């Protein structure tokens, strides 16, 4: 069972130089089927000798090659792109490890085959020839690879790692805790009690339901995204690959639950301070500023603490999203920019908070239209991202019809705002504008719903078969989930568009903010659900085509 | 390296019947140092033949023995102490597994030694004799042990386990989670916020600082005992052995943290309901009753849920403590009954709560002396436990001087109460009684302190050497701990006695309840500390002598 081990661990590149162990076993078998045995031993040992010679030659060649490579590498390092030199060093070390493995495999193989010969031929001169020719010859007796590996570890540690031996050991030959679950629980408990205190304080404002709706939607989105990370990692959907995250260290669901719990503790504490007004030297309007200043400082924290790698990945992702038509559209850039299409209320509320704190401390009506643009920003991002994807791949259908799906948000918002500004000023064409808004509402709702179900989710496939109205490969355990989500998306895709249109117009105040406050945390739920089946379709059928 | 494996895994009892592998290797070595080889092979194979014969005979004998044993076992089970029959079944199964291991070891050993002979003697007839005599003979070809083991598993599962195969697999051949840490965190968070709400409610009663001091001391004791369990398990101090707990499943520190956190949530909720009086159909005095009714129902919960095995171990332990002079003094019975010497305030407060709810809803003064007895109950327990240990072991010194250490609590409490009842009634002998109380206070304080430091802690040993003023073997990492604890115990052992004496007398009201409320959670801390070094001395020097 060494032949299988060899053929499985043999180096693809040097598949020749390895001892033809299977061929030697074939030779021995054919032999076992005085002169006969004598001449067989003669020819067989001649074959072993030329094999040993070949291994010696190849080992010497690649040893000299690695010697020169280490020489050029030490020169180029002495010259001072630095991470590129690090990568070259790691490649060289991997090559050295591979060659050492080759040497060990050949040694073990020679011993095993010679032992097989000894046992089969009932002759002890086999091990004699072993200890005579092998173990006294180069490619086994030589240890230059050992010292090369030693000097390489030393040089990377003292130049590149500057003395951090363990981190160098991680950089080379490289193959949720208890405290994090405890903190997830701590923050969920503090958050539960603070929410109960919040409800009890409310029982025993609209410029303050608009400044905390932002925080509420963001924290709900982070909790639900932690649930998404869990429900992906537990159905095998490799999100680590699709997002292009470092597969060694990435956030689990407990780290998202902990980030969301902490931000929720901050939100609840600020809201409480707004109710049970503590020390009255500082007014009420300072707690929203303190809350969002703390959130933004947690995001752009310069010191490498508190999820530094995660926060800065997110910051690069946001920079690449908001300056959209320039960077090439990854998948994280398509995912994020398609989840500001549901957190559009966070942008509306940031804009309203800026307005209010500047001018009202009017702002909720169309601030000359600055409130109808900041609503179409997260549809503009995706419109132009799909336009760039069409400019790159030059595939007309998916990307052009995608951009046509997001243009309907522009048209719907525009016609809602125009019909509003016309009805309040009592023009004649108000009914015409209302008809146009109704048409484009139906269009955008059906457009986005159809696209969701067909291209985003892959459902309604025609190779359905047993999985009625779905695709063939389903990853989620109970088939009720997909029907629940189909019904849910049909319902909550008209809700989202009606909420956008209503938030544009100033016609229905009161019922223009109990709607945009009871429909806004529903549409983050709808995005939390769409995440499941979009990432599933990306894993299975690669509908996005980012890899 | 098979000889070492054999000698390590050979059955102690049947050490003869196993193949003398080492002797065979000695024989082969002495041989390798035509007629010579021929006659050596003859005699060697004769030895192997008689060895095989011996193994066959012994295997047949023990197979018939196990057959009859299974027969008697099935009879006795058919007859219907039941757990005793279960234990007998497990013993039989272990014997069967041991005999099967014997068979496998002999097979492997015979193959290995015959292979050694084959390789050394350059003769292939070795494996021929192997396959001829062995593998065609009983003790290898027989499989009766397999079916016996099968029928045994089946019979235990269907009669004793009634169909629970996996639990039977646990009962035979038998060798903190994530959710528990999450719940520890949840309960600690809820508890933190409820305590902050508590302090804020108090800022914005003595019959109610006496009904919640019980709960507070109990919850503090459970938190600190969880810390004790951790600091034991992390310094290797085998508390699982000393307490005689089931070493397979015992409580970690996180389960004590979770029990204490839950009871603390109940305490804080009841106290809050006493402050922010909710629905006023139910008065205030119903929350203490609800709290302690819930705690007692959590303890004596009949259904097997919520730490059933732990709670019922504790209930048996308490039954064995409170009816003291009868049961033999284990170690858990000495530990518990020596930790009601510090939770004496929980008993005082239970008695005061009964008094109050019966008569005052007077009670805090000596209720005709029922308040000076319920203080000496947890010293009476230990007095009589040490008396029984002296009656059993008939070792005068440790147990008699122990009971003399606990009699001083009786004398101190008695003289405090008498001097009080004499001074308030203005007798002449009040100063005499005060002198007697002072004498016995000094006596009890110094007595218990000296005993703590010397016999309970083992410190002040005279083989100290480098560990000044301590013993030789220390288990706790930093030597500052032992000096901190020496100083702490010296301080807080006068505090405890002054608090007991004060709680006896009614002379210093106000300062008779800010003292018994600021000294009571200090003396549970002192017991939490004494736990560390008492259990350490029990692990190391076995000062208690319970095993
Ligand atoms: O049964 P055979 O003769 O056809 O197989 C051989 C077997 O001889 P046997 O009859 O059991 O005495 C063992 O030889 P041996 O006692 O000298 O042992 P050493 O090699 O010196 O240790 C050896 O097992 P092993 O002891 O290494 O584990 C095994 O090597 P290999 O495959 O690497 O083993 P596995 O990968 O299967 O474990 C041999 O080669 P194959 O034919 O390829 O299997
Ligand atoms: O060098 P900087 O500061 O500009 O950049 C970072 C680098 O700094 P440093 O070398 O320590 O001074 C490492 O930081 P760090 O040690 O805190 O992190 P670790 O504890 O080592 O994780 C980090 O290591 P690591 O994430 O690969 O393990 C590396 O990840 P990067 O290679 O992007 O990751 P991949 O592309 O391989 O996925 C970062 O980006 P680079 O610039 O590409 O190196
Ligand atoms: O070299 P020797 O003569 O001193 O040691 C023997 C060795 O010979 P070789 O290496 O071929 O020259 C191996 O023979 P073999 O491959 O035919 O045996 P198999 O039938 O294949 O098992 C065998 O290794 P291995 O194959 O079990 O892995 C080893 O078993 P042993 O170490 O007891 O077992 P472990 O203690 O390692 O578990 C033998 O026994 P010893 O003398 O006690 O060491
Ligand atoms: O039989 P009952 O009801 O009167 O007593 C219990 C027994 O009931 P059952 O057999 O299931 O009907 C088992 O309950 P269970 O299965 O819920 O617990 P498990 O899930 O199996 O743990 C338990 O098993 P287990 O603790 O040993 O594993 C056993 O522990 P006990 O032997 O004391 O422990 P040790 O003396 O060996 O330390 C209890 O005491 P016994 O009376 O001595 O058996």
UniProtKB/Swiss-Prot annotation, chains A, B:
Binding positions for phosphate per the UniProt entry: 338, 341, 405-406, 493, 526-527
Record annotation: effect of changing residue 90 to N: In IBGC6; phosphate efflux is impaired; present at the plasma membrane
Membrane-side (Cytoplasmic) residue stretches: 1-175, 237-249, 324-328, 395, 458-476
Reaction catalyzed: phosphate(in) = phosphate(out)
Result of changing residue 94 to P: In IBGC6; phosphate efflux is impaired; present at the plasma membrane
Residues of the site described as Gating residue for phosphate transport: 496
Regulation: Allosterically activated by inositol hexakisphosphate (Ins6P).
Result of altering residue 526 to A: Decreases phosphate efflux
Residue stretches making up the EXS domain: 362-547
Subcellular location: Cell membrane
One GO cellular component term noted in the UniProt record for this chain: plasma membrane
Effect after changing residue 389 to A: Increases phosphate efflux
SPX domain location: 1-175
Phenotype for residue 213 to A: Decreases phosphate efflux
Any matching Pfam family: SPX
Stated consequence of mutating residue 406 to F: Decreases phosphate efflux
GO molecular function: efflux transmembrane transporter activity; inositol hexakisphosphate binding; phosphate transmembrane transporter activity; virus receptor activity
GO biological process: cellular response to phosphate starvation; intracellular phosphate ion homeostasis; phosphate ion transmembrane transport; phosphate ion transport; response to virus
Impact noted for substituting residue 165 to E: Increases phosphate efflux
Tissue: Widely expressed. Detected in spleen, lymph node, thymus, leukocytes, bone marrow, heart, kidney, pancreas and skeletal muscle.
Similarity comment: Belongs to the SYG1 (TC 2.A.94) family.
Pathology noted in the entry: Basal ganglia calcification, idiopathic, 6: A form of basal ganglia calcification, an autosomal dominant condition characterized by symmetric calcification in the basal ganglia and other brain regions. Affected individuals can either be asymptomatic or show a wide spectrum of neuropsychiatric symptoms, including parkinsonism, dystonia, tremor, ataxia, dementia, psychosis, seizures, and chronic headache. Serum levels of calcium, phosphate, alkaline phosphatase and parathyroid hormone are normal.
Protein name, UniProt field: Solute carrier family 53 member 1
Protein source organism: Homo sapiens
Primary gene name: XPR1
């Amino acid at each position: 069972k060494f032949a299988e081990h060899l053929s499985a661990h043999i180096t693809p590149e040097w598949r020749k130089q390895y001892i033809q162990y299977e061929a030697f076993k074939d030779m021995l078998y054919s032999a076992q089927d005085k002169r006969y045995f004598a001449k067989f031993e003669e020819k067989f040992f001649q074959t072993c000798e030329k094999e040993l010679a070949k291994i010696n030659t190849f080992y010497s060649e690649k040893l000299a090659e690695a010697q020169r490579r280490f020489a050029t590498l030490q020169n180029e390092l002495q010259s001072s792109n630095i991470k590129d030199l690090k990568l070259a060093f790691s490649e060289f070390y991997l090559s050295l490890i591979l060659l050492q493995n080759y040497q060990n495999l050949n040694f073990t193989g020679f011993r095993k085959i010679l032992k097989k010969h000894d046992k089969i031929l009932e002759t002890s001169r086999g091990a004699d020839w072993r200890v005579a020719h092998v173990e006294v010859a180069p490619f086994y007796t030589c240890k230059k690879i050992n010292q090369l590996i030693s000097e390489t570890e030393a040089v990377v540690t003292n130049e590149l790692e500057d003395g951090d031996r363990q981190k160098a050991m991680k950089r080379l030959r490289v193959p949720a805790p208890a405290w994090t679950t405890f903190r997830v629980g701590l923050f969920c408990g503090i958050f539960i009690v603070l929410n109960i205190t919040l409800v009890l304080a409310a029982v025993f404002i609209w410029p303050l339901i608009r400044i905390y709706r932002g925080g509420f939607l963001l924290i709900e989105f982070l909790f639900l995204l932690g649930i998404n990370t869990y429900g992906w990692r537990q159905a095998g959907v490799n999100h680590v690959l699709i997002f292009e995250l470092n597969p060694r260290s990435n956030l689990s669901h407990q780290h998202l639950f902990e980030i969301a719990g902490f931000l929720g503790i901050l939100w609840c504490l600020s809201l409480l301070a707004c109710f049970f007004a503590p020390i009255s030297v500082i007014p009420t309007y300072v707690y929203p500023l303190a809350l969002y200043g703390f959130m933004v400082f947690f995001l752009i924290n310069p010191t490498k603490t508190f999820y530094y790698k995660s926060r800065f990945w997110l910051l690069k992702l946001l920079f690449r999203v908001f300056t959209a038509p320039f960077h090439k559209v990854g998948f994280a850039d398509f995912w994020l920019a398609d989840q500001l299409n549901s957190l559009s209320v966070i942008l509306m509320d940031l804009e309203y908070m800026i307005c209010f704190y500047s001018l009202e401390l009017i702002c909720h009506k169309y601030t000359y239209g600055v409130r109808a643009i900041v609503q179409c920003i997260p549809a503009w991002l995706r419109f132009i991202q799909c336009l760039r994807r069409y400019r790159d791949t030059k595939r007309a259908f998916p990307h052009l019809v995608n951009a046509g799906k997001y243009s309907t948000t522009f048209f719907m918002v525009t016609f809602a705002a125009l019909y509003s500004t016309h009805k309040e000023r009592g023009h004649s064409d108000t009914m015409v504008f209302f008809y146009l808004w109704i048409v484009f509402y139906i269009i955008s709702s059906c457009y986005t719903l159809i696209w969701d179900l067909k291209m985003d989710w892959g459902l309604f496939d025609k190779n359905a078969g047993e999985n009625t109205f779905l695709r063939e490969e389903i990853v989620y355990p109970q088939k009720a989930y997909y029907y629940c989500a189909i019904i849910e998306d049909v319902i909550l895709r008209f809700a989202w568009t009606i909420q956008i249109s209503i938030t544009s117009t100033t016609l229905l105040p009161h019922s223009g903010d109990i709607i945009a406050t009871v429909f806004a945390p529903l549409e983050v739920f709808r995005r939390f659900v769409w995440n499941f089946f979009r990432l599933e379709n990306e894993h299975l059928n690669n509908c996005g085509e980012f890899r």
